[PDB]
């Protein structure tokens, strides 16, 4: 009698999934995201919900994942990649049209919640999801529920500054201080992401290589790539140790392009203990399992 | 039988006990000596209080215990240097056996935060961060009225995170004071943002060893050095907290410990935090603890709500 719907809103496509009481996906639909019209945007979502409700014979719950946030006070979307919905009160408008509550969360929160509801992680008291891509995105799950935060920006771990011990590793007053898109500076977003991995390589070795090129060189034993990787893994361990001393997560799930670098899962357990408290224990650290289905899954799971 | 929630606060010399009914009315209060050596005597003191209360109220009460330390999450052994009688013992398992019911044991800073989070004004807040600013920085993370203990029972050890880059910049980067830490790391914010940290920063910059109350009294008199120290301290506090808040985004932040009595904190933080937060961020509500150093019992009891 219960169905959970999830929408993942991208700049060009809206993805839809319906999950039964056992969290098995029983419907999948994809429609175009309207480029300009808000009215068309609402219709696309309302239509999907009404059709699914007719199909499954229930009134499904509605969760939506977005590349941005809803302003916690006004309900207006801050989603620059979705011009049709930018500035609009999406939740209120959908609640009125669908006559039921609607939840809207940032895509990184949906990613973490999706991974936290994997059979292997169900019942974990806390899960931290980190996406290491062009930036660092984070999602904090406690007892299977997203912690959104006072202003819907819990998990913005990427916009915390390099800690003293990370600065020390990188040469203190000679460390590279990368400018940040948030307009602060030295945010870890610019060090631990895939882009950060690249920028650190370029800063020290004066050659602009992509992460896969660096990794391929690493595997060939090229000395510059080997030195870069050594520095990167220690830097990652120091920064995550700082984060883990505050959050002490039970499981850490990595997504984004850099989570494909398998060496991470070998090196973190070896390097974290030196930077953690003496009594600390290591979280389980794994690569994301749900991939492209993450956005829809986590959005749906907002209403569990 | 009715619900009854018991809480114990274990200190080095006293064990404090409280019972709270379904409405969270306190219906018992007892204080007994903490045994100095005997583990047997330690267990008896607790078991006695539980059994007497159960008989008196006609209930089987839930049992929560706040300790100055943690239980090892794997072995159950207590890591509590201030309590030599219980140090190294499997307190939870031993009490569960004697009392035939589950027992929850949590660090005292978690109990402090949970106690505050269950005040009428904060009930219903989706998240509460408690920070105790005393001889060190203690922290407690509450989500939806429940303690997040962490993978190894040390969630909230915010005091053992290192100064962020922006804090170091304020303090002079390569010339900043790097204080050694009891955890054996260095530059942990435990040694900057606590009452002791406030004192050590004053001494580093002004070459005079004053207590926090002396500095504050001089601040209130408009003394130049104290005014400069307070300006530096408030900005340092805002920077470090803004970093913490960018990760945690707590709805409410509750300050305890001696330094939470410095009223200026509550005025200055809202003014200084925005520059270091994300542009879209909003300020948490930041308040002084309501229940003082007498919420260990409350928080311990509330572990079982
Ligand atoms: Cl799925
Ligand atoms: Zn930033
Ligand atoms: Zn420390």
Question: What does the domain layout of chain B look like in residue ranges?
Answer: 4-114+294-302, 124-289
- In the sheet that holds A251-255, the strands lie side by side as A145-146, A136-142, A126-132, A251-255, A284-287
User: Among candidates B135, B172, B152, which has minimal Cα distance to B76?
Assistant: B152
Q: Which ligand is nearest to the CA of B242?
A: 2
Cα–Cα dist B155/B106, whole Å: 11
**Distance, CA B282 to ligand 2 centroid (Å)?**
16
Decide if domain B124-289 falls under CATH 3.30.420.40: yes
CB atoms within 10 A of CB A206: 8
User: Which one of A73, A173, A182 has the shortest CB-CB distance to B174?
Assistant: A173
Question: According to the entry, how was the structure determined?
Answer: X-ray
Decide if domain B4-114+294-302 falls under CATH 3.30.420.40: yes
In angstroms, this model's resolution equals 1.7
CATH number of A4-113+292-301: 3.30.420.40
> In terms of CA atoms, which chain B residue is nearest residue A148?
B249
User: Among candidates B227, B226, B190, B192, which has minimal Cα distance to B208?
Assistant: B226
Contact of B7 with B18, CB cutoff 8 Å: yes
> In terms of CA atoms, which chain B residue is nearest residue A284?
B151
Task: Specify the long-range contacts of residues A266-269, CB closer than 8 Å, at least 24 apart.
Answer: A267/A233, A267/A236, A267/A237, A268/A233, A268/A236, A268/A237, A268/A240
Contact of B156 with B141, CB cutoff 8 Å: yes
Q: Cα angle at B135 between B134 and B141, to 5 degrees?
A: 55
Strands A61-66 and A102-106: parallel
B68: contact with A, CB 8 A cutoff: no
Structural tokens at position B281: 């961020």
**Distance, CA B197 to ligand 3 centroid (Å)?**
12
Q: What DSSP string runs through B93-146? A: HHHHHHHTS-EEEEEHHHHHHHHHHTSTTTTT-SEEEEEEESSSEEEEEEETTE
Helix, coil or strand: residue B256: strand
Domain A124-287 homologous superfamily, CATH: ATPase, nucleotide binding domain (3.30.420.40)
End-to-end CA distance of chain B: 16
Contact of A192 with A178, CB cutoff 8 Å: no
Interface test with B, best of A159, A246, A273, A279 (most B CBs within 10 A): A246
Cα–Cα dist A71/A153, whole Å: 10
Same fold? A4-113+292-301, A124-287: yes
Structural tokens at position B270: 């809202």
The reply to whether A35 sits in an annotated binding site is no
Q: At what angle do helices A194-205 and A211-219 cross, to 10 degrees?
A: 70
């Amino acid at each position: 009698g219960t169905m959970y719907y999830g929408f993942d809103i991208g700049g060009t496509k809206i993805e839809f999934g319906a999950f039964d009481a056992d969290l098995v996906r029983v419907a999948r639909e994809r429609v175009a995201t309207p480029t300009e019209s808000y009215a068309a945007f609402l219709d696309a979502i309302v239509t999907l919900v009404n059709n699914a409700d007719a199909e499954f014979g229930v009134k499904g719950t509605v969760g939506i994942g977005i590349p941005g946030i809803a302003d916690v006070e006004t309900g207006k979307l801050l989603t620059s990649n979705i011009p049709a919905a930018m500035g609009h009160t999406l939740q209120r408008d959908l609640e009125e049209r669908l006559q039921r509550p609607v939840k809207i969360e940032n895509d990184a929160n949906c990613f973490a919640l999706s991974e936290a509801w994997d059979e292997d992680l169900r019942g974990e008291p806390s899960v931290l999801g980190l996406i290491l891509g062009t930036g660092v995105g984070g999602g904090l799950i406690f007892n299977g529920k997203v912690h959104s935060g006072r202003a819907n920006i819990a998990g913005e771990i990427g916009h915390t500054r390099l800690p003293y011990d990370a600065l020390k590793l990188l040469g203190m007053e000679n460390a590279p201080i990368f400018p940040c898109g948030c307009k602060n500076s030295g945010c870890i977003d610019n060090y631990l992401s895939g882009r950060g991995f690249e920028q650190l390589y370029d800063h020290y070795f004066s050659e602009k290589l992509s992460a896969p090129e660096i990794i391929a060189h690493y595997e060939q034993g090229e000395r510059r790539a080997v030195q870069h990787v050594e520095r990167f893994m220690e830097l990652l361990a120091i920064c995550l140790a700082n984060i883990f001393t505050c959050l002490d997560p039970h499981v850490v799930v990595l997504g984004g392009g850099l989570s494909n670098f398998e060496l991470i899962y070998q090196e973190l357990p070896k390097r974290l203990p030196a930077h953690l408290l003496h009594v600390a224990k290591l979280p389980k650290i794994i690569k994301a399992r749900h991939g492209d289905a993450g956005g829809v899954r986590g959005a749906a799971f907002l209403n569990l």
